[PDB]
Amino acid sequence: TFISRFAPDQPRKGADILVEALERQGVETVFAYPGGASMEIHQALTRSSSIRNVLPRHEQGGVFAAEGYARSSGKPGICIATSGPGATNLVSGLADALLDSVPLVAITGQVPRRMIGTDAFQETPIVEVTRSITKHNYLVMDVEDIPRIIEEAFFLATSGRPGPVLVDVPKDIQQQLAIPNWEQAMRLPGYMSRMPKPPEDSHLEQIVRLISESKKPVLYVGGGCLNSSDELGRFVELTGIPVASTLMGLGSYPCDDELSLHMLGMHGTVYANYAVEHSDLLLAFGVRFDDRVTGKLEAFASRAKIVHIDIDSAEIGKNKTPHVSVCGDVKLALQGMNKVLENRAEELKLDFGVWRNELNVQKQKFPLSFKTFGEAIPPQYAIKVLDELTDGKAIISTGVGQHQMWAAQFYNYKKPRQWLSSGGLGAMGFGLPAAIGASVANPDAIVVDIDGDGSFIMNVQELATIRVENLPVKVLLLNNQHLGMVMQWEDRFYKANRAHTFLGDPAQEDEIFPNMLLFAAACGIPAARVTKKADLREAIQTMLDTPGPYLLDVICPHQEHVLPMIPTGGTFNDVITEGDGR
Template sequence: MKASDVLVQCLENEGVEYVFGIPGKETLDIVDSLARSTKIKFINVRHEQGAAFMADVYGRLSGKAGVCLATLGPGATNLLTGISSANLDHSPVVALTGQAPFERQHSESHQYVDIVKIFEPITKWSTQIKESQSIPTTIRKAFNIANMTKPGSVVIELPEHLATQEIPNKPLPVKMIPPTIPINEIFQDALAVIRKYKKPFILIGNGVVREQAANELLTFIDALQSPAAHSFMAKGVLAKKHPQNFFTFGFSEQDLVLQGIEEADLLIVIGFDFVEALPKEWNKKKLPVLHIDSMPAENNEYYPVEVELIGSIKHILQQLNQFNIEKKAWEPFGNLREKIKQSYYIGQKISQVSPLLTIENMLAVIEAQCVENTIVISDVGSHKISIARTYQPKQPNRLILSNGLASMGIAIPGSIGAKLACPNDPVICITGDGGALMNMSEIETAKRLGLSFIIIILNDSILKLEQVMMNKKFGESFGVSFSNPDFAQLAESFGVKGKKITTFKDFEESLKKVIESPEELCLFDVCVNN
């Protein structure tokens, strides 16, 4: 059997449903094999960066590795941003790239660059297939590495001449990795730490969402009754009205949650990745830490660990909940929870007298009109900070952000990955005008696939976050303004329904109409009030 056919059968064996990518000369055999697959759909995108972002978000929401494909040289390097973003946000992704034959890899050659070395610093594993018969072993190892704790990106390079070789068809069986939990003595040490301190504060990280441990954590929080706060990517674990919910931490400025953290005497940190926010930003007092995660804690002076519970977060919490958890009910000083709600515009009432078209008012409408399983995807920019503060998803993993790399351009292609991973869930894409034009071409991909979701472009012709930072640092800004096309007309040129929004009432009514009839892709060009 042709090696590329074996590769595709190995992908089928891993449960792959979609491969996002662009064909090239060095990957033609792979695409030909994909064309004959009855289980995998090859999705031809408009830019390889978009393919990587699609695979990233698909991986986060489906719970299995997203797959993308690019040819050698510029095709592969175009994947870099999306692959590194997925790796830092611990999203399982396997990228396949083409490469020149071996005889061209030893001297200067057209389009040849060392893809494996380029990707090594930003992946869990980057490798070249050196003999075609190793394809089954390499694919099985790649998916195992991409999905195992903590998930991330893997890159496999297949030189062109190997793809056509005849090899045996032997995909390896997929075996589940059994969960691990600490021994009983470590649990007793953890319980002793909880008993020792009077004011624990729980910090919820992205690992809780990745490992689907929200229910187990809720049981633990309800027993302990101590305050808790989410990282940006963990939002939705606690309901907005939950009395222990102190919302979101990790902001560089106006992070009111820090007042509660600094009042605590113990931090119970669960599934938190340092890439979300460094401990020196939220543990300035170097409070002792009870670390619960799938991986041991990194050495850090602002993260002084007393006890570590290492293994499956879900199973650790299940076991912890079997013990008698001593109640540690306390509230931070000064009615802090209500102050956070007011400062972050959580549950705000919108003025009925000429309400402004602000991001906070729009988020209030989105939150009110959306159902529980609605997925909101935010691009990067000043609006991301507002969304992280204000928007309260009704379930975990219903707010998707690029947080580790914080890469602009993820929202539109990411929405395609989200809709394919969760076809029955409404998807709303919120992007600034800067991020929108980075991957705007992917709305053609969405239209071609017949996907229906809402794109909201916040149009102010400026990189707002950079403007604010420059004004603060220099007293003025430079190089942050630009002009935009008519986004509504641009959408129409792709066959997508486009509408220009200039008033809050128009936004509210238009959003309601689209949510009630979600059969088509639509784009709102929103002229926001700064």
């Protein structure tokens, strides 16, 4: 039974209805930045004793913090901004949440309804702007529509395929007095009629029948299995099928397990891409067949019967036509198949040891490799030390670039929602704010931001947010003085012609620029720099043991390349296995 701060017959401001609408949704943390259009909302937030606001230093850091809050907990992330410039700073976060299917609810202030369309002070048509980069958006035109729209916003953002939902609230609606009606029915008739239903037994028995008829099955797990870690693990025990995860599906099946093929795709392991290339049954659970995994669609799984399970009917058959399809929750599809695989266990006699040994041979001949040059710190080795010292139980958020791939390859994630990274949009500056949202949603957890010197500096202002909110956010900065991912593509396909990829100072060429330690010192965050490989283990241990925030500037040779690499539009026969920029 919800206990309101107002009487059921007492009129209250629309902003007070908005905050209470969040309280009735279970919202405990918002990321709001104040402004003229949203001052009424911020005043109403102070009256709430259950909703905590984490003030960022940039609205892009506020929406990215809402993503990490959502990616690391399954709950929806709520960010609030003002009209005009405050709303336009959320654009990168909204498009990022849409491509990665992150439940998010963004509330933006707006000019009064009478001033909309008049080029008013700090007015931008944020609904027209964000319609193509959000799952759905609203423009509240009456104070009585607030309880319904907020309920519809959280329902659309969390149900089906999750995504961001923006709610634009004009200022005159926030100030208008009204008595809210919390019993209104949602006006989503076509959406609810198209919601997926529990999977039929005829579809599940046909999948189990294809498993027994197959000799080389491979599991294709992605971001749709973040809530099916137990169901997927039970499915692997009953089948013994090796698991290949996407960049979004890391942690769904433990990377340290013997049946794990780790990541597949452009920068996936050689044995994971080998398994899909020479498979006869591809179980695509919670994936969307991105070109980062398939490359050339004509050659991707060219000899496999494709079984695609997805909660979005628009994804089934988009880039590749499957043989058997199941539109619904992969969590329920696994539960239904586990019952069939257990009763009919001895009837099926499932054993793929011959196919697994074919992959174990490929795993031992082409494993993830990194070369150590003298005392220079290998970035792959540094992340491998972080795995050991944290026992693989740390929540990892990353930026975008070479460090993002090495953090995915050389860290064994035991559970999903430990791996927070921008995969669909690939937005730099995501690592640091996402670690803020993850640390708030998981206070007793080890949160480490494996960031790059280019991605870290984009939202470096959020270091002040970490200090003020006293969050134990660790920053494992892999500094290579370059935009490493773009630098790698210059060495491979452009004759190493540098085109504005060096991030240091050309005057003092051999000086670490910028001095990231002074960035942490400016915000009162203890920091240290490590350059020699021998001092690396003690430095990372000091970062973890030191209470509160900590930044570790790890210097790495910039000539390193992420391996292996399948060029864009290439096949498995075009995989690059060796080479760098020396």
